Amino acid sequence: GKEVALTFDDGPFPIYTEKYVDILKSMDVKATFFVIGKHAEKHPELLKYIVENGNEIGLHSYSHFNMKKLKPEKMVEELYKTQQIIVEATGIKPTLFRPPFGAYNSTLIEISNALGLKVVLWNVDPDDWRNPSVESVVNRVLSHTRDGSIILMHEGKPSTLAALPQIIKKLKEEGYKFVTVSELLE
Amino acid sequence: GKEVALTFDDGPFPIYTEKYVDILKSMDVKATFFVIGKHAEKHPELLKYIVENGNEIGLHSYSHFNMKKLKPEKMVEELYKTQQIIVEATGIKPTLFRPPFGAYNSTLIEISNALGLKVVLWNVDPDDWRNPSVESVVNRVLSHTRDGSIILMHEGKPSTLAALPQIIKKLKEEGYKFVTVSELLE
Ligand code: NI
Ligand code: NI
Numbered sequence: 001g002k003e004v005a006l007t008f009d010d011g012p013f014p015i016y017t018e019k020y021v022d023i024l025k026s027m028d029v030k031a032t033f034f035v036i037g038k039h040a041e042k043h044p045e046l047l048k049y050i051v052e053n054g055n056e057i058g059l060h061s062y063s064h065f066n067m068k069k070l071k072p073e074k075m076v077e078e079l080y081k082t083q084q085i086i087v088e089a090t091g092i093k094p095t096l097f098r099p100p101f102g103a104y105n106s107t108l109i110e111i112s113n114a115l116g117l118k119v120v121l122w123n124v125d126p127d128d129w130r131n132p133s134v135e136s137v138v139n140r141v142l143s144h145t146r147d148g149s150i151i152l153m154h155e156g157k158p159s160t161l162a163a164l165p166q167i168i169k170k171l172k173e174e175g176y177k178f179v180t181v182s183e184l185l186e
Numbered sequence: 187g188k189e190v191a192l193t194f195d196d197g198p199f200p201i202y203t204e205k206y207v208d209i210l211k212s213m214d215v216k217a218t219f220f221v222i223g224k225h226a227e228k229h230p231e232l233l234k235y236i237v238e239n240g241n242e243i244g245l246h247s248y249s250h251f252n253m254k255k256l257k258p259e260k261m262v263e264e265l266y267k268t269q270q271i272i273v274e275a276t277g278i279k280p281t282l283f284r285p286p287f288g289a290y291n292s293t294l295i296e297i298s299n300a301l302g303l304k305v306v307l308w309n310v311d312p313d314d315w316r317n318p319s320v321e322s323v324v325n326r327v328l329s330h331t332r333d334g335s336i337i338l339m340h341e342g343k344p345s346t347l348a349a350l351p352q353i354i355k356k357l358k359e360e361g362y363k364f365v366t367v368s369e370l371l372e
Contacts, residue, residue, distance in 0.1 A: 001255075068334035069187075102309025103334030106371050121307045123288025130329075143316075148254035148289030185292050 002147040004176045005184040006031040006167075007122060009060055009098060011155030012039055012046035020155060023164045025053045029178040033155065034098040037062030037082035044089035051090045056180035058096035059083065059117065068103040075111040083115065096120050096181055120181055122152035126163075129154050134162035141167050142174075150181060188333040190362045191370040192217040192353075193308060195246055195284060197341030198225055198232035206341060209350045211239045215364040219341065220284040223248030223268035230275035237276045242366035244282035245269065245303065254289040261297040269301065282306050282367055306367055308338035312349075315340050320348035327353050328360075336367060 006024075011017050011033055024031050033050045035057055040047055050057055061067060062078045062085075070078070079097060087093045097117040099108060104119055112119050126132075126140035137159065141151055153160050168178070192210075197203050197219055210217050219236045221243055226233055236243055247253060248264045248271075256264070265283060273279045283303040285294060290305055298305050312318075312326035323345065327337055339346050354364070 066333055101332045101334065102307075102336075103332060104371070105334070121288075121309055123307055125311045127326075140313075146287045146289060147252055148287065148291070150288075185290070 002176050003179045003184055004145055004171055005150045005179055005181045006153065007034060007150060007181060008032070008153055008155045009034045010039070010064070011035055012043045012050065013156035014043065014046070016156045016161065017043070017046040018049060019161050020164070021049055021053050021055065023161070024055065027165065027168050029168050030054045030056070030180055031178070032056040032058055032096065032181040034058040034060040035086065036060045036064045037078070037085050038064070040082065040089065041085045047086060047089040051092055056096070056182055057086055057090065057092065057094050058098060058120070058181065059086070059094055060098055061100050064100050066101055066103050067099050067108055068105060072107055072111055075108055076115070079112065079115050079117060118185070120150065122150045124149045124151040126151070126153065128157055128160050131157060131159045134159050137163040138166045138170070142170050145171060145176070148184065150184065188362050189365045189370055190331055190357055191336045191365055191367045192339065193220060193336060193367060194218070194339055194341045195220045196225070196250070197221055198229045198236065199342035200229065200232070202342045202347065203229070203232040204235060205347050206350070207235055207239050207241065209347070210241065213351065213354050215354050216240045216242070216366055217364070218242040218244055218282065218367040220244040220246040221272065222246045222250045223264070223271050224250070226268065226275065227271045233272060233275040237278055242282070242368055243272055243276065243278065243280050244284060244306070244367065245272070245280055246284055247286050250286050252287055252289050253285050253294055254291060258293055258297055261294055262301070265298065265301050265303060304371070306336065308336045310335045310337040312337070312339065314343055314346050317343060317345045320345050323349040324352045324356070328356050331357060331362070334370065336370065
């Protein structure tokens with residue numbers, strides 16, 4: 001066994017969420033979507049869409065601001081609002097949280113855990129936010145992926161929608177099974 | 187206040203550890219060295235050197251193998267040996283552990299915590315392992331660094347020794363204070 005977790009930050013987006021999900025469903029492959037609360041409450045049917053197709057939803061905060069310096073009650077507001085938006089939309093209560101920019105402190109770990117959330121970063125960054133060549137995304141992913149890789153990618157990127165089927169195809173050929181972040185960590 | 191943690195994996199190395207430390211001491215700036223146990227036990231005087239100059243030492247495991255699939259007792263061996271090498275060399279007991287490739291599971295969190303260690307990844311990756319242009323390292327670091335950034339870099343790289351003083355200089359100009367990973371997280 002060799003497992004890899006594909007992850008998508010910053011969604012959901014109209015058009016692109018549905019695109020990303022169709023691709024993953026068509027290739028028998030699941031992923032984790034770390035969703036911004038302001039985006040999620042505008043588009044509750046897109047969260048239903050992510051989850052009915054077997055994907056995991058995580059939190060990416062409500063506002064998508066650096067949380068490093070927030071007071072604790074403001075950490076609670078950002079995380080609890082997003083949990084509530086997600087559970088109202090899907091009936092599934094998320095267990096993971098990726099902080100904006102991956103910026104955290106001990107306090108944000110302690111608050112997250114008290115809300116039943118694990119904080120997760122990533123360990124493969126193909127820098128897909130600053131839109132690169134769809135061949136360049138693929139190479140970084142395929143040269144850096146090992147057993148237990150958590151690949152940071154972004155929703156709403158056409159250069160990411162383009163890279164997905166090559167990435168999936170090569171890593172299936174290299175003997176990787178695709179898992180949610182929760183099933184990777186257990 | 188805006189704080190940033192510079193980190194160095196895979197050391198210590200003869201020549202380059204001393205180089206990296208002299209630079210940081212000369213510019214009044216501290217960093218965290220995530221040290222491989224096999225390297226550390228060969229070079230105990232280089233760990234003394236990292237710490238006498240105010241830097242933090244973390245664990246990077248004993249063998250530097252993917253730990254995702256180890257039995258728990260083998261996780262204990264890799265982490266406890268490295269803790270012991272470090273405390274025998276420096277008298278300071280490390281509190282942080284970065285897993286090889288950032289690959290982890292719940293079991294490795296639970297074992298780490300029972301040995302008084304926090305697991306830490308990173309959230310800025312200038313891909314300095316696959317030796318790039320010393321101007322290209324700088325740009326990735328400076329375009330991606332925010333408050334609470336943990337910058338993954340590697341010991342024993344001349345293209346990294348070259349980038350250090352520009353990186354430090356620009357981020358001091360942008361108003362960043364340089365902290366150990368422990369003082370960033372508190
Ligand atoms: Ni984001
Ligand atoms: Ni390493």
